[PDB]
Subunit: 338 residues, 4 copies
């Protein structure tokens, strides 16, 4: 038996009762979902920008970040639908700290019940300020505690091909983006969109902390996220291949480009050069780039498991580069529209 | 909101009470796990052969195939540890029938509670006759209904990179093998072994159908499964590359070779050609090929979702070649040792 | 804190899966409930006889008794609907052994999970042979494990006035009888019938071992059980007072007379004297004595927690007396009839 | 078959997370339980006074009652340990509104999840201000949502004889009092004290909303509550009868007298007459009357189901002036008993 311990877990209803969505928060989520929805459905020419830390490890810095990006959101609101990256669970290449929910105190105490309280509280506050949130849905149980406060979800490169994750995505209430695979493979994400578009029947855990059988309807609001592979995949020809690829699979030829991870070749400031290309293509009149993803924090760089506004997982651009980038992208959209 | 229905699910304890492991069943499981443990520890020289249908879709044909194989298990137990493939859940490239548990009646009725009863009864019978079983652990909730009757598990190509699956593997009581990824990537499986080797803390569902926090020990008994990519990866060249990679990563250099899927270029009869090559290597002295995987059924080929013992998912070799193969492999094992 | 321990409890569904009602078991229950319905609705002139041990403490002796009583049940079937007392939970005046479910091994080990398995098995066997069962519904959680195999329920003297019990009775699928209170009070039972006749909404535990809100419909098949008080209340005097009382309260004037407990002044053999009196009433034309209750076992008397077919709680008449009594009652029904 | 529907129920942990006991709330509960423990143990000779509405049906009127009673609690805290009656579940003689938790909105809507929220919030507020609470434990599942904020529990006349209730009482953290039975029977309550004094093993629902097997230790802090029967049973005559019966039973000879229900012949006003009799006894040296129970509200009487603000919708209560007066009488009488 390779189970050392079983410890009790507060059900989703405990967290949803202790921290109910406020009316303003319920409204943030609703609008961001239908805004992201029309960006996908043609209807609105703005760019979805999902940006924020690689991981949330500090609610204080999280909130300082939030107020600064909410400011920029209201400014750039006519060009950009800015959603903040509030990533609570992190996929490791082997082992490592898996995010705030799993180990809030960053010493290996795994106080997951606190992790969940802290996480839902923070997510409530940010959404209540009027700023929408985005998260990676990695774990299969935590979605119930958080999904109602999320306006967009990502399925990571390491899990796009997983049927379990494509099943989860077909019953989420928010739009979802599928990262291409670690090696560059586009085909797994394309399949994943088609798979998540269908109804599925599977086993999941209810708001009451009990397993049950779930039938989903399928999620039409899914799109690919170009995130690099063995080499970058943000460029025009790459984008072109993915567009004819997506049209051959029967799906809207529209992409979100992630400036980070393998697209910034692990070189975070390169995120701005990726930005320069994408902005040059947006400004060039490239309709299909529907959204982008960027990893920023208050201070650039990263640490390892302690500084204040700096990432403890992936390296991010800091706030002045963030502001700059966001301005570029908006100007590029402006140019694209007229 | 995108969930169309929630239906109740019998907890693991209902299935474990209606169908407890008999003393014979329990003994099969224990000895098979010990066996594969010595083989992986290197202090036994026999080959692990995980063979059987691609998917179980018919308990009658499955009980038949099991007694036919038990004959060969007993007949070859000094050169080979034969474990039957009792795969109840299947990973689709997009959509399709996901296995017997998910849809036992192969019309889309999703009678998962029956699915689970049928699945646990069949697994009990096969184990009680003295034949061990192997399954793919795809879903996160079904393990509790079945893992005590499983002597080896596989994590599939589409989920080896998934942290959720590596977490599951670190707390399973049986040895586990990690398929390399769909395109050929060896590195994800190597990472997966290292990942699954560590203790993890995560959320899972207990025998009582309730979520809880779980801590694992890490599973020492995990190995890679070479299953092909864009290119076959069974040859002696590939087996050296993979052994060396494992050495860099500080892992025992051992592999299980899967004769099927991308190694047999998806046409089943090529499994005999892979068999020839691998027997050649084993006989020639390759100490590292620790196990193999083959997809066989009573009748060969496959059919689309209906002929008694033919596969309804991947094409398999039929019985004559199966018997032949188990012997090519057994002779090849005698030859590797003196 | 005055809680020494919490230990896990198999959900109703574990017991209902391990021991499903067979088709015979199901038809016993259905037919007996329809029978007692027909008697309480006044369409059939037979007498309901609920007879059997005070408590079940030994499945062997219970099975022996069941065989003997089943025989008498088919012999006497034209005048009597004989239901066996299979009482698994017992109300103590202060402390004592609370029944087989609570402590199956009569040493204070409280192996309630075994208790429940033993109890449901035994109840299944008795019912499957074609003999109906009657139980006291004392505890609020155990009903889910047993009620589908019960053809009549009693609410005890010490709990008739309890709202919790009257709530339980309004949602039971079998007829229910309310004992008058310990002191003789008729009024509490009359109120209890009216209370249980109404819809109630309250909290209970589901087949899955989880609390939920329950709305019941109300149970029209409830009647009083005259069980004595500070003095006996079986005489025709008493039966007229109680019929009139029921008329005032707008209830059908019908009674079940219990020959035991305070009606037999706690010494068992007096049950035959009460039997004589009540047979004399029935024969003389008393249409209202709808049923009776008697405490019998194989061997007469009782012991203290060991002899075989002897009660370990209240003293009972033994099998010889039982056969005689049952013959007396049948003849009296035959006289009443003409 | 006879069940028309099943609806979901928030587990105890949802309520305990949304409304945790504050540090003040926790302190109130602790000291009140310790206090009643020492009265019941004979180390303090103050009188326990459990007083308040028959039923809580209005959190606004209930909070006001609580600030007034809290005021009186601090001025009389030298002779009386005053605990407020916060009764959320009510036993009906046949059918009727079963209390705030069961039907908070008093139209039969049965919004029990709201009922529980409302009930735990109110109980938290009252305790956090520093006023202890008392409830009847009628239902077997609701205890998990409320017992940590309760400083004393009662088991009603209609359930004292029920084993299920005596099992619950043996594992409650607060002292418990057992009403004698509707008809006057003392013996059922005496048995219930002895029964609740022993360890029990039974099935109950955990903080997580799941059934489990529970072993309790037995509750030493239980006492009888004289509440009348076919006749009143408050007189020193009756108190003498009941005192030797508890001794014959092996129990400390101590009683709580309830001035209401069958002791006040169901007309509320009579509670003052009972008060006079019992004060007379206490002053005269009757060391066995350990506590009392009274039903009061802001406004006297009761009313049938807009409502008249602080008035009972179940049993008739004395109103606030009579309450203040009564509490003063009792405190003076406690003074006459120690010399
Ligand atoms: Pb990252
Ligand atoms: Pb396959
Ligand atoms: Pb008895
Ligand atoms: Pb009252």
């Amino acid at each position: 038996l390779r189970i050392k311990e079983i410890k009790e877990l507060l059900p989703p209803v405990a967290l949803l009762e202790k921290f109910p969505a406020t009316e303003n928060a319920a409204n943030t989520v609703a609008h961001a979902r239908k805004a992201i929805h029309k960006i996908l459905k043609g209807n609105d020419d703005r760019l979805l920008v999902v940006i924020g830390p690689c991981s949330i490890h500090d609610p204080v810095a999280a909130k300082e970040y939030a107020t600064r990006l909410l400011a920029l959101r209201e400014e750039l609101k006519d060009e950009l639908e800015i959603v903040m990256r509030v990533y609570f669970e992190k996929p490791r290449t082997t082992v490592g700290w898996k995010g705030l929910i799993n180990d809030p105190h960053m010493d290996n105490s795994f106080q997951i019940n606190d992790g969940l309280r802290i996480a839902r509280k923070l997510l409530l506050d940010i959404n209540d300020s009027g700023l929408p949130a985005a998260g990676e849905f990695l774990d299969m149980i935590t979605p119930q505690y958080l999904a109602d406060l999320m306006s967009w979800g990502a399925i990571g490169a390491r899990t796009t091909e997983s049927q379990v994750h494509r099943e989860l995505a077909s019953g989420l209430s928010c739009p979802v983006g599928f990262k291409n695979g670690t090696d560059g493979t586009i085909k797994v994400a394309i399949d994943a969109i088609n798979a998540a578009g269908a109804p599925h029947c599977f086993l999941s855990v209810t708001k009451w902390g009990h397993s049950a059988i779930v039938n989903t309807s399928g999620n039409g609001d899914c799109h690919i996220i170009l995130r690099g592979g063995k080499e970058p995949n943000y460029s025009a020809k790459h984008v072109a291949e993915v567009k004819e690829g997506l049209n051959k699979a029967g799906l809207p030829a529209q992409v979100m480009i992630d400036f980070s991870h393998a697209n910034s070749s692990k070189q975070f400031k390169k995120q701005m050069d990726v930005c320069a290309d994408v902005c040059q293509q947006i400004a060039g009149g490239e309709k299909a780039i529907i959204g982008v993803m960027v990893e920023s924090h208050l201070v650039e760089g990263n640490q390892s498991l302690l500084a204040y506004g700096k990432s403890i997982t992936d390296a991010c651009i800091g706030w002045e580069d963030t502001d700059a980038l966001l301005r570029q992208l908006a100007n590029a959209v402006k140019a694209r529209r007229g």
